[PDB]
């Protein structure tokens, strides 16, 4: 598994354990604004943005403060989790129309 | 330089830093030229509002913890200037949110009344936005200028 | 708990190059003396000339940490009133004898009350809610 | 309270023309974020297939080799992928082309004289005077030259020019057609123009019946606004056709009487294919990639 | 030089339009804008590719070293 994709920044990820940052290599607004769209979705999701430090450099920065009850790791899981099923909703929708034509 | 003696004078003595303001009158030679200058006086203007997730990006937009930019290792917001009908912050808040994650948390908030190149009559009737007003580190009123 | 309630009679409503926001002039149906000037939010809550307003000052609503967004079953002193503003007082401002006007900022919508007998309930406060009806 | 399955209750597709090359369709009520995104792939994501190597024997021509090989490299080539795989770098160039990853088309003209009578046409006055794009003859080589049997490699576009020669002047390549994707050259985009726009949204704010109405409906396009009679007010007929010129503001009598703005949750796509793909197939694999680019994010381990 | 290949603003393929412009403006006598049209060229910036050419080509291949006078 390649390690260098996702990683947690220690430097801001809080002690334990609602608030932190996620860095994501070769990554921009494409996948950035849809992950912070659905992430804030999420009832336990407090505070939700994302930010590319400087465009010369392939690099995506996510930041994920939650209330309790669930971490900011679980935050992005479940993000992710549910960009997958919208993306089979618009998939299923598309297929659908096309032979309704 | 090629050593540790010069590295020391390049950093504290002829560094970039202390020169904020030239020997010649005591004033400042450094500060934001054009861009910037015109985005403040919309993003500062009252017509100017902003949603929670607006908000939020614009703070960390320019804020980040990572590049050590916060002094509190938490980013630290104000509550809404409008509750209902819709959640909504002003622009003036933005600056307050700026000042209040990069001052020292140890240290009040900063107290200023100045003025703007603005003149109140092109902001229309009985307005006071010529007026900057600074209270305890919060924007409360006037636009931000090249003044 | 409540530091202000009455009813105003709206004199002007004036946009001053603003699409919107907008003063509001407006006089006490129950005081004589007691005078408002109020910037809204017309968009979300328009305002006529020749209006009734139910103007209310609140400490807050019936230790809080901080706002957060509405979720099912949330009772506040907000549903009661159509328009809700937090904002500061910033100045205290004595007008001749007896007659007292205070100012208020719900981030640059500013607003400024005269009156008299409001002097002990009134206090500078950097926390005080401003809901409106009808 | 958005739910993925309260998505696919008000969410709508209308296709408007669908042509071998352009289609014309509609995303109703999906956020901009969606619709920025596909699009955003539909010109980036969607790699082809083209020349990449050109190898020169001999180049008489005024057209300089850089140029010619340049030229030979922006001609589409009628070539589906799929049929051929990613070439790797690293391995030299021995191991680097074969059957399953490279495509060779050979150029091989010489220009000659012809007797004629005499402004006269060069292809009267010369012969192979003019190189085309259907000059580039399909070389198949190695494990696979059976694959492209009912599939023979054709230039998109045949009667581009290539080149133009005088007699005694030659061309003599071997070019090397690979895999790409389209944000490294131009020379690999699949589609010509991927582009939405928001429904124009008219709001009628008072019924300006009469004349005034005949005023209106041509300060908007032909097909748009749509008078019932003299009085029953002034309606919108079709709103879709607008071109958004916003030449009934600069009129006194309407300035305040009508308001213009979109709908957000409407966009009108247009997509244009290069002639590789067949527009439908660009924007399905659009939403395969949205899709693929959040499943791999989905399984995959968040280090540190 | 020569009628460049795709449109530099869109891309879409122009250089197959060139000759077919000309047989349009002598043949079908018609005008620049109309001659534009019937070759599917509706964008302004398709639309001054070709009509803005040149074709220097023309001029410069009448010197030729390689054949006598
Ligand atoms: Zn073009």
């Known amino acids: 598994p390649d390690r260098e994709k996702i990683k947690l920044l220690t430097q801001a990820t809080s002690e334990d354990g609602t608030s932190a940052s996620f860095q994501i290599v070769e990554e921009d607004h494409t996948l950035g604004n849809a992950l912070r769209y659905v992430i804030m979705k999420n009832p336990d999701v407090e505070f939700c943005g994302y930010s590319i430090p400087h465009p010369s450099e392939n690099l995506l920065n996510i930041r994920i403060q939650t209330y309790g009850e669930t971490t900011a790791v679980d935050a992005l899981q479940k993000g992710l989790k549910d960009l997958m099923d919208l993306c089979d909703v618009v998939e299923s929708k598309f297929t659908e129309k096309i032979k309704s034509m | ?147 | 708990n409540t530091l202000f309630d009455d009813i105003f009679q709206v004199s002007e409503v004036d946009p001053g190059r603003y699409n919107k926001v907008c003063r509001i002039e407006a006089a006490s149906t129950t005081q004589d003396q007691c005078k408002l000037t109020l910037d809204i939010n017309v968009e979300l809550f328009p305002v006529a000339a020749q209006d009734s307003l139910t103007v209310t000052i609140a400490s807050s609503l019936n230790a809080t940490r901080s706002w957060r967004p509405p979720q099912a079953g949330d009772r506040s002193l907000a549903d009661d009133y159509d328009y809700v503003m937090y904002g500061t007082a910033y100045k205290f401002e004595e007008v001749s004898k007896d007659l007292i006007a205070v100012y208020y900022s719900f981030g640059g919508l500013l607003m400024r009350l005269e009156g008299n007998y409001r002097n002990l309930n009134n206090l500078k406060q950097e926390n005080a809610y401003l809901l409106i009806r009808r | 309270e958005w739910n993925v399955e309260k998505f696919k209750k008000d969410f709508e597709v209308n296709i408007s023309s669908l042509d071998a090359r352009e289609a014309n369709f509609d995303l109703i009520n999906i956020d901009t974020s969606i619709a920025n995104a596909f699009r955003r792939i539909m010109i980036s994501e969607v790699p082809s297939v083209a020349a990449e190597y050109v190898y020169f024997f001999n180049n008489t021509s005024v057209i300089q080799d850089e140029v010619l090989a340049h030229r030979i490299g922006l001609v589409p080539l009628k070539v589906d992928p799929d049929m051929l795989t990613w070439v790797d770098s690293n391995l030299p160039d021995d191991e680097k082309f074969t059957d399953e990853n490279t495509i060779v088309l050979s150029l091989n003209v010489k220009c000659t004289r012809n007797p004629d009578a005499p402004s006269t046409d060069p292809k009267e006055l010369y012969n192979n005077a003019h190189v085309y794009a259907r000059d580039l003859k399909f070389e198949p080589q190695g494990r696979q030259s059976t694959t492209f049997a009912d599939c023979p490699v054709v230039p998109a576009d045949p009667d581009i020019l290539l080149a133009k020669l005088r007699p005694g002047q030659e061309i003599s390549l071997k070019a090397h057609c690979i895999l790409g994707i389209g944000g490294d050259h131009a020379k690999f985009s699949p589609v010509s123009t991927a582009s939405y726009r928001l429904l124009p949204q008219i709001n009628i704010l008072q019924p300006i019946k009469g004349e005034s109405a005949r005023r209106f409906q041509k300060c908007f396009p032909p097909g748009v606004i749509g008078i019932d009679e003299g009085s029953d007010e002034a309606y919108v007929k079709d709103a879709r056709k607008d071109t958004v010129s916003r030449e009934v503001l600069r009129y006194e009598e309407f300035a305040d009487k009508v308001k213009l703005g979109r709908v957000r949750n409407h966009f009108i796509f247009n997509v244009e294919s290069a002639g590789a793909m067949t527009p439908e197939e660009i924007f399905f694999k659009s939403v395969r990639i949205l899709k693929n680019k959040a499943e791999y994010l989905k399984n995959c381990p968040i280090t540190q | 030089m020569i009628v460049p290949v795709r449109c530099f603003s869109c891309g879409k393929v122009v250089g197959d339009k060139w000759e077919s412009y000309l047989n349009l403006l002598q043949e079908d006598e018609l005008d620049e804008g109309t001659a534009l049209s019937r070759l599917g060229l509706k964008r302004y910036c398709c639309r001054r590719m070709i009509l803005t050419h040149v074709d220097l080509i023309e001029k410069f291949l009448r010197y030729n070293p390689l054949e006598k006078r």
């Open chain 2, 1 to 147: 330089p090629q050593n540790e003696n010069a590295r020391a004078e390049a950093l504290n003595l002829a560094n970039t830093d202390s020169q904020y303001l030239t020997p010649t009158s005591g004033s400042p030679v450094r500060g934001l030229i054009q861009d910037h200058i015109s985005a403040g006086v919309w993003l500062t203007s009252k017509d100017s509002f902003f949603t929670r997730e607006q908000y939020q990006q614009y703070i960390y937009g320019c804020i980040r913890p990572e590049d050590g930019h916060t002094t509190r290792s938490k980013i630290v917001t104000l509550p809404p200037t409008i509750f209902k009908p819709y959640p909504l912050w002003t622009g003036k808040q933005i600056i307050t949110t700026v000042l209040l994650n990069v001052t020292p948390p140890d240290m009040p908030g900063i107290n200023l009344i100045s003025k703007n190149k603005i003149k109140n009559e092109y902001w229309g009737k009985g307005s006071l936005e010529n007026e900057v007003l600074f209270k305890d580190g919060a924007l409360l009123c006037g636009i931000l200028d090249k003044s």
